[model samples]
Target chain A: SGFRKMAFPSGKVEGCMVQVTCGTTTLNGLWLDDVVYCPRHVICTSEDMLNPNYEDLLIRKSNHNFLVQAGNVQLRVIGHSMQNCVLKLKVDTANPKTPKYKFVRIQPGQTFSVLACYNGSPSGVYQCAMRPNFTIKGSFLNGSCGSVGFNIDYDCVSFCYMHHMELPTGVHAGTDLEGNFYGPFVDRQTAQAAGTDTTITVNVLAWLYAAVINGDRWFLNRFTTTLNDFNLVAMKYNYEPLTQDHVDILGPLSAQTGIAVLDMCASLKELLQNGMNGRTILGSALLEDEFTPFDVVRQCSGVTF
Target chain B: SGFRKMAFPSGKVEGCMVQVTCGTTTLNGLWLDDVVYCPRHVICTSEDMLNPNYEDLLIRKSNHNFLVQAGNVQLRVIGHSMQNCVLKLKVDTANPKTPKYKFVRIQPGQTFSVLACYNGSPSGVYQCAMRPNFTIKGSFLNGSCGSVGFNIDYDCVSFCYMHHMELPTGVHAGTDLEGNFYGPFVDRQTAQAAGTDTTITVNVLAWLYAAVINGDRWFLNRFTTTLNDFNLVAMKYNYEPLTQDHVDILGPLSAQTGIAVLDMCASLKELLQNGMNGRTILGSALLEDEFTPFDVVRQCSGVTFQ
Candidate 1:
């Protein structure tokens, strides 16, 4: 019902787009300096699941082929040779406390996505149970589905928190309970905190404005990281930081005077509005400029988030 | 110390830049359709001050020449012939309550600006006592100061509230009180309310994002106003509004979907970040585009609040 991939801007930069395709042995889990590349979809087994770094399970496959990003998850059935192949995405909530079983059927070429907002518990605990079913030479079979291809994308942490709500529809329960269920498995506060605790991937200009206003630890940490990356980029291309006034304006406005007297707010607002023009002062620089350009520089150093 | 007209990006779009230069006879207080053309600086008289509309005094000239915009006020001494001329701007607060008189001196070619934030009371009552002084052939004279050109810009209402606080410096009092005056005549709540009650002039894309998320009346009202203007602009060019999906994407995100599953938020964010490209889909359009372009259209109707 609601498990279809919608059109989206390609938010990719060089060296950052990691492709994880299922059923390709050569593309299985591997390590790329710091990026822990998972070229092929690998299952998350009991042994892999025991790792302390929960995000690693998603980064490198577990034996059971369960992959999970802490705050984000995406799955798609790219292709299949079988004519009657179906993929089942199961949410196994059968824990000691409560037993809840729900799954959605996805035909080849279909996709599903969900933002596992932070609820008090660990995110992506039991949502990676994927199974494929199809008829091979007139005999019904499960798993593989005759060279099925699946792609999963996950992000352990993100800067901005998407709206906290349930999926529109698509999950099915017992025969007696087959209606769309209410959601909100996560709350805004927890989700926001989780996101803020990590480096944000929003537009650099947007992040700058937020960081300047917040001055919180998360913002500070991210700022310093970008600051380091920015200097490196500047060193490479013989570029200078966009002048001190540019940096100062992003900081707190001078304490009260007439609103008209201090034009910093209005000035910064315009800078932000024009940030993406690709020709503007901010659009041309790195770190302090667009996040993509700055990230490209950082990725060149084999460092990315 | 901190009142000067800065080198700002001239945020003007015709008809909105009201020239309130003082000492120009023909530029004196008068009325335009809704603009209340106060070409010349006018006094805020006791009789006129009694009127309920605190803003009208700034529009016209009261006897006292006390002009003010609710959340903003700007005073400048444009030009003066007198080599030793000086302008004194006083803030008289002598009442049945505490007495406080503070003023800043202005030199020719220099200007001072301040954002009077809101407190509990009305804005712009005590900040408009601007008097000039100079020496004509050794005899000290006050008032006109031999051909002084004073220009004041004010807004009775604004959309966004600048940070709330006091002036950086520049105020004079009794010999015992000759330093800067600490302010906060108004709070954030009061100033924000005064601004939001009227039209907002932030970049339209920024406003749309804020409005869509908040869904508050202030945003809704601003949205409707822009919507109306958008249709008019569309009609003039025989153009159609941007597709419905454009509008839909600006609405609330569908529930319980994976963040990646729905890209409305990401889409809207990009729209805002790329809003000022001037050639992009949003840059070329209005109501859903840049605030300046949309405002240029609205100003044709003679409504400006900045």
Candidate 2:
């Protein structure tokens, strides 16, 4: 068996009461008799307790008192469980001061809603202890005893009381201390990071086409992946002549032609459009004419006038 | 074997002259002959053929005592074995009042260059012609003829002149008539229309995620290539005691667990983070715990007292 603990400071002792509950069915054997021991004193017994239940246990120290007002307080406890079991709680006072209280014999999958209220004093800190229910069957109760504490201030009402509460797994979505959802793979960071990468890719593509043509070469291999084929097709058709209906048809067709062909055609077209008569046109043709067979066309079209 | 012919308007003639050159070598013989035939009477050809090479063949008519230009004047010729030829031309005057010229010849794979100088007169339009040079052994007259036409307007100096021209294919990139680079697939509308469905799949994963979370379910199927991984992992982490860091490590892990698990975790995480907490933190075990069991140490280590 294993155990865990927490501790709280000592302060005023009004109608302050401490309660303990089992966190799981395995620890159902825990009872009020097992958790009656106070943190300041040691008490152990082999009374062979009959009735064992978390809600029946309630300990209130008539003589003990509390001090420290606000700020920080430490709590301690000891217990055991299968593994990964969790303990949840809520106290009466908004912030606990002292006059620490302890609750033990909490089973796995069980919860104890402890309410600690100080009648006369103003609201302050309060302490509560949680201990896991475990067994030491064959051996002496060596370190079987565990303790936990919390500061309990004052409550406008009169008494400080706690009730045994059981919480089921998968009851609600899990949350961090800040109360933000934490589950699956949809964390804020992942979303943000993915969003940022997308933005960068878009920006880069925009700049490549608008500012630098050579940059397009960088996207040559990933072009199909980085840019939608439909968009590429649209861009290709952009250069095409609008038909009689004034709708652009060639852009998509041109985009259908891979970047290699588009690049070649673009370069050759530029040369011919900008070339000086036959000299520049023929010069450009000499470089490469895989798409357009300028040599054949020129031959078929005689030069005589 | 092959021949093409073209015509140009008289108003486009420059210096009333034209030139022709061969584009390729052929076995068949080639020659250029021009007959400046008038629409009216048949003029004597003896005077016009004064130039031996027919280089200076000028048309003249005597009206009373002064020489007046006749009706329509044109240069015509035939060529053989012409390949990759060019036609260089010179205008008779610095600026001809009626600058009109036309070309008809045989030069395979050959292009013609027209230079129009305008001191004040109208510009000339030049047409082109092409013909394949091959022997016709069976025909009475075995030969090839080429033809093409273009007109030069006096006011259109901006038009392509002294420039090598090819038929325009008419495709533009962005606003640039010459730029050729295409696009980034951001959505289905642009993607499907542009034939970029594949690219949209690869590049738009993050975008699809955002859209899904934002409730833009319209793009769910089209934007996402894999349906098995479409759930919200972040939501699952919300129910557990996991922190931001915990969720960070666990969310992706949960996604791989299974589609159902992934969706459950993500939906819970999203509701909790977006609905309850209004923010996210590291080491949040809520997500991991929802998908698969996580140790208390992992959950407790992420809590901050303050």
Candidate 3:
């Protein structure tokens, strides 16, 4: 019922913090082994921690590196720096107005202990390390860190609303709030902080060409579903539906070659070629954080509306 | 002042009808010379019919062949076939329902006369024509067409809401209801019936290139103004704004040549080239009566919604 083993353990991500929001509760913590270590809540693979009624397990890679999962889980980092590890934890349990989170640093090899009572002896000690070798092992017994609150913030890439909650097992591809696919990052720090300079852009024309040419129903359906779901939420904001016609036009062109295309068709054809040649069109290729469907519509029309 | 002369005379449009809706009154009639020969109402260029405190004379060519004017006037046609001219007119003046319109036809050269009284001898004989030649002249001295009801119906290219009333003299280019420029027609019959085959689609990319390349302010403003105004009304109908960004992209591409374009830029550049080469793109260049802003948005995106 639990993760039988680390079927896939993504190599260590350094100096990073993972945040997870599940149902009504949000947990911000670091990952050790397959378990998530939050100051207030600890989730492990131990069967004692489970209720038979728990929902099925779900894992989605919204980013190439970040995975979102379900099943009474919170943050599960692949790896993190050990020494001077900054643990964001809750301090005063009852106060609602004051600062809710504090960063507590644990020196390398030292175990941070949580006590169940007002006693010098602690109930549990969780090991901190340069890596998840867990050369020493300990268990978290019990202590109340109060109701966990506030959404987690990051210095790098952030999740779109889809990531705000545990997603249904059916969906996989992740998009930012604007519904754009994740592209390259200048560096790991930029990816972690979710900065704009390092962005996520899709070769829209390329995607269209591939999906139609290859007749890959699964790939096409996934992307289209994400686009449609995104548009459903977007319509509330006065945005128009990003309908299927965007891809249907490419159906007729799949077999042709060197036939001159014009207008929007022309623009898309060139974009396809550029994508094939590995060249990027400035405004057309880049999907910045501020990009909107309105912008995409204009780019498609090649006219301002 | 009145139109001293018919500056332009479009040869007779045969077996067709014209409709005009003024401030509150709509007139459906046949063209007798420059004046509209509606049985219930008549509009002539005679200065004696003037009111000193009238609004300014404004005329706009909403359609390449049809002109819209504002004054104390309604329908005006350049020419019509008089011999078998089918006049769509009001018969019984006061009825709210039960057949408001009647079609009365005149012989090859018969003067269709209307009487001020219920007498065989009519008050005035308004001469119908084979053309604007006025081979035999007569005047529409008097008769009431009632408070002319119903918008005039036609067989050819109808107007967008811009023609809902006489537009401010500023607009010239005429569009159908969907905010698309009127293009070619299969024939005069199709144009008058307001059918879909004879559509209006601007070479959007061509227009974009021309406007940016030649820097034609007047040409640009007229088109842009119409596009904006159309979008304003369209927005009310769940249509998104056809923003200025549609054209702004061509600004940087004005100088380049043979640079393989891609995506929207590629599509537009090719459309520009095809337009230059006089080749048409099927869906991209046609504005049928049923076209919508949503459809346009899709064509531009080249995608569909769920």
lDDT per residue (tens digit) for residues A151-178 in model 2: 2222212111221111121011111212
DockQ of 2: 0.01
Regions of model 2 farther than 4 Å from truth: A1-24, A28-305, B1-306
Overall lDDT per candidate, in order of appearance:
0.22, 0.21, 0.23
Please write out the lDDT profile of model 3 over residues B1-306, one tens digit for every residue. Answer: 000000000111111123443333433333222433332112223351233111221122111232322222333333322111112222212212122223332211111211111111111101111111111111111221211111112212111111111112111111122222232211111212222111112223333332232222221221123555554544443323334553343333333321111222334323323432322222112211222222222112121111
Between candidates 1 and 3, the one scoring higher on lDDT is: 3
* Per-residue alpha-carbon lDDT of candidate 1 for residues A1-305, written as tens digits (9 for 90 to 100): 00001111111111122223333221111111222222111333334424333344334533234332212333222221111111122222211211122223332112222112111111110111111111001100111111111112221211111111111121111000111211223211122111111111222333243223222112122122234444444344433333344344333322221122123333333333344334322112222322222222221121211
What DockQ results do all the predictions give, each relative to the true complex?
Answer: 0.01, 0.01, 0.00
lDDT tens per residue, model 3, A115-198? 111011111111111101111111111121211111112221121111111112111111122222222211111112222121
User: Candidate 3 regions off by >4 Å?
Assistant: A1-305, B1-45, B48-262, B273-279, B283-306
- For model 1, how does the per-residue alpha-carbon lDDT over B176-287 read when each residue is reduced to its tens digit? 0111111212211122111111111222333343223222112122122244454444444333333344344423222211122123323433333444333322112223
State the lDDT at B260 in candidate 3: 17
Query: Model 1 in CAPRI terms: which quality?
Result: incorrect
lDDT value, candidate 1, whole model: 0.22
